Design a protein around this ligand. Structure first.
Ligand code: YB
Ligand code: YB
Ligand code: ZN
Length: 610
């Protein structure tokens, strides 16, 4: 049963495994480099181990010290997105289970793919710089030497030296702060993470941060300008935590903090232990986008406790988490809401399968990331095809209450471990041994290794969705002499979620006659709405329907924020519309240098430039 991590160039967990990382680094905004030492406590899994390989990517190694002496090490040739392998020669051969501490002096590249450095003008305060990291999936090797594979979990401690005006925060418990001995204009922030965790969950942010308490164990952090809005926006957090605890068991991380990042954060939320990172585009003003927090919260169990062994099994992380996420939404807003959201998820699977091609390898639940940059393969598939499979199983095995019992057992069984799809499927059969006849009905191969839409579609309640479908159908089948019958009251009973589903249903049939679009703005005035999810969908609709007036609005949104979920589709649609083509390219080239590194790359690919 050998399964290697094709995305790593480091020695596998079967040879040696990292037990603890003690980091000591200094943040240098003048050189945009992170400098310091990483002392790795490594444990051998083999007899007579004489050397080990680590992953690195654009790092400048100064020296490697073991037992107080400098040792030999070599850096192989870069291998694109995988980076360069760093082979270290141990001074003394190790026997099984023996441990040694290897301290490495390094420095990050200003162009590290895991970090984004912001000048004062790119922040809200305008007076200070700001730095933040993003390691998922494999950018940790770009911050420090390590076994960059989720098959290895470790604990860590850290001391970060930063300018005294700023504050530092990490995916761990705060352990105090003191003045920097070797420099009076700096402070040293200390942190401790006692729960073993894969290295892609290590995070760091340094900026002019303020905090405000919103719950017994929850603090919300951000620049002074966003504090008030953030404390209200995420006020349902403690109730979400209680429900999740009841669903998966005790929360083992201690603290659950929320940090609101700069507009340029590439994703909606990142489940970093003790410190979830959220995009500021969630500040809708009405708490309507809080399901992004429920998602992050769910990972404190599925994802952070039980982890995927290699990235080929990414669906194990995201599929269960979305499934739990929707149960939290079910308990807070009703079962009909869970079905509404679940059905929207199926639509999101249809769209993604349409965009890749029904036979595209990326539409497979379990993909083979050999020679595939994980950033490139990322999509809605593992989320929605993963969710659909669990929902289908739920209905097949007797209902939500019985499947939630398997899920809690699943978490207990695999806590602090890293698993593969096969491990999951074996425990499922073991947990439901009294219903194997049923389990033997599902087409596992089609579900797990076949591309395109799932072989079978679950059953969804339509209640909350019918209203959206109905309004969408009236607009699509409407002729010119029907436009006058549309009025602002059509929307009086629709929530923000139903308004978003209406646009999604209409976007799936885009384009629409240009006159219809003008009529829609005339009566529903969608140009005024600020809900980023609805605004994004409205602007795509306009652009795809060729309305020149929306070009500037689409351009503005595509660049004032950088959540890839919006930015990538907006640039792609502007590039496909002959009227905005030239300008979309020019805008990309002008903002490129100051965009998140990963986002620049992907947008560069979509537009096919450089
Ligand atoms: Yb302490
Ligand atoms: Yb007519
Ligand atoms: Zn997730």
């Amino acid at each position: 049963p050998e399964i290697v991590d094709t995305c790593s160039l480091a020695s596998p967990a079967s040879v040696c495994r990292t037990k603890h990382l003690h980091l000591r680094c200094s943040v240098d905004f003048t050189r945009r480099t992170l400098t310091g030492t990483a002392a790795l406590t490594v444990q051998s899994q083999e007899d007579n181990l004489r050397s080990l390989v680590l992953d690195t990517k654009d790092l400048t190694i100064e020296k490697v010290v073991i037992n107080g002496q400098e040792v030999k090490y070599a850096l192989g040739e870069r291998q694109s997105y995988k980076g360069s392998p760093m082979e270290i020669s141990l001074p003394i051969a190790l026997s099984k289970n023996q441990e040694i501490v290897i301290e490495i002096s390094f420095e990050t590249s200003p162009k590290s793919s895991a970090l984004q450095w912001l000048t004062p003008e790119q922040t809200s305060g305008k007076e200070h710089p700001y730095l933040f990291s993003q390691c998922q999936a494999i950018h940790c090797r770009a911050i420090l030497p390590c076994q960059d594979t989720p098959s290895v979990k470790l604990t860590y401690t850290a001391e970060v030296s930063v300018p005294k005006e700023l504050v530092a925060l990490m995916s761990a418990i705060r352990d105090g702060e003191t003045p920097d001995p070797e420099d009076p204009s700096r402070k040293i922030y200390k942190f401790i993470q006692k729960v073993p965790i894969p290295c892609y969950l290590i995070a760091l942010v340094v900026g002019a941060l303020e905090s405000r308490q919103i719950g017994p164990r929850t603090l919300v952090w951000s620049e002074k300008e966003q504090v008030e809005k953030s404390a209200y926006e995420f006020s349902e957090t403690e109730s979400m935590l209680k429900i999740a605890e009841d669903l998966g068991g005790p929360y083992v991380w201690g603290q659950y903090d929320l940090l609101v990042l700069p507009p340029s954060f590439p994703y909606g939320g990142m489940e970093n232990p003790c410190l979830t990172f959220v995009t500021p585009t969630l500040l809708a003003g009405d708490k309507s986008l809080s399901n992004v927090i429920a998602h992050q919260i769910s990972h404190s169990w599925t994802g952070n406790l039980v982890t995927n062994k290699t990235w080929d099994h990414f669906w194990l992380n995201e599929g269960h988490t979305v499934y739990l996420e929707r149960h939290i939404c079910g308990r807070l807003f009703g079962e009909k809401f869970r079905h509404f959201n679940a059905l929207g998820g199926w639509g999101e699977l249809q769209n993604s399968v349409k965009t890749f091609g029904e036979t595209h390898p990326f539409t497979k639940l379990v993909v083979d990331l050999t020679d595939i940059d994980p950033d490139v393969a990322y999509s809605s598939v593992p989320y929605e095809k993963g969710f659909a499979l669990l929902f289908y199983l739920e209905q097949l095995l007797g209902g939500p209450e019985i499947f939630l019992g398997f899920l809690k057992a699943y978490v207990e069984k695999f806590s602090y471990k890293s698993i593969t799809t096969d491990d999951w499927k074996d425990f499922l059969y073991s947990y439901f041994k009294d219903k194997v006849d049923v389990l033997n009905q599902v087409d596992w191969n089609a579900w797990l290794y076949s591309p395109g839409l799932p072989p079978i579609k679950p059953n969804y309640d339509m209640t909350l969705t019918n209203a959206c479908i109905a309004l969408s159908q009236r607009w699509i089948t409407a002729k010119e002499d029907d436009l006058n019958s549309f009025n602002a009251t059509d929307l009086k009973d629709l929530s923000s979620h139903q308004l978003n589903e209406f646009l999604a249903q209409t976007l799936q049939r885009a384009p629409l006659p240009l006159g219809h679009i003008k009529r829609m703005q005339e009566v529903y005035n969608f140009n005024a709405i600020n809900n980023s999810e609805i605004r994004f969908r409205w602007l795509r609709l306009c652009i795809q329907s060729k309305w020149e007036d929306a070009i500037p609005l689409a351009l503005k949104m595509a660049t004032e924020q950088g959540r890839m979920k919006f930015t990538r589709p907006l640039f792609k649609d502007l590039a496909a519309f002959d009227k905005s083509h030239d300008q979309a390219v020019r805008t990309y080239q002008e903002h490129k240098a100051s965009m998140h590194p990963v986002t620049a790359m992907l947008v560069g690919k979509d537009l096919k430039v450089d």
